[PDB]
Point group: C2
Chain length 98, copies 2
């Protein structure tokens, strides 16, 4: 119930290999934060520059705290230098297997 | 690896309760298909009409075979009566924890 899922859709403008390298360090940063549960970076099949990240947090407060960390800035900056994003925060309604 | 992840973004134009009920039946239909791994239906926080579904399949062929089932067609008809959607098929690039 409390758990939140942040979903980002990226359009990569720069080199996808550089994007992935930057994202790996971004994810490691977030993995150091209290409340981090898991993440998966997905790449669209047959597209080169289309990515979706799914990140799970114990609660909304922990997610907001992570974004507000001073340590996030270089990662946020490096990501924005390479891509644009459309994103939203979600709660789970249904899961299978149950 | 071989796993594929299908991501759907729904904009619901009917009643959300009816959408969730019809979606549950469609999800059950896919859950019976060979190669189905898991799915999660997510609802955007502070919104009534925005959902994202994430579904994992063992491989691309299993996903294709499921989509091609004649039984899918009336399910699709019912779900699309209540919602529009934008979707894509993805491969996992990074996951934490490892
Ligand atoms: Cl800046
Ligand atoms: Cl069938």
């Amino acid at each position: 119930a409390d758990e939140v899922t942040f979903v980002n859709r990226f359009t990569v403008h720069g080199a996808p290999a550089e994007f992935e390298s930057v994202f790996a360090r971004t994810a490691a940063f977030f993995a150091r934060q209290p409340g981090f549960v898991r993440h998966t970076l997905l790449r669209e099949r047959d597209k080169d520059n289309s990515y979706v990240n799914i990140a799970v947090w114990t609660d909304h407060d922990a997610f907001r705290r992570a974004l507000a960390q001073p340590g996030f800035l270089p990662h946020a900056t490096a990501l924005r230098a390479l891509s644009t994003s459309e994103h939203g925060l979600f709660t789970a309604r249904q899961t299978l297997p149950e």
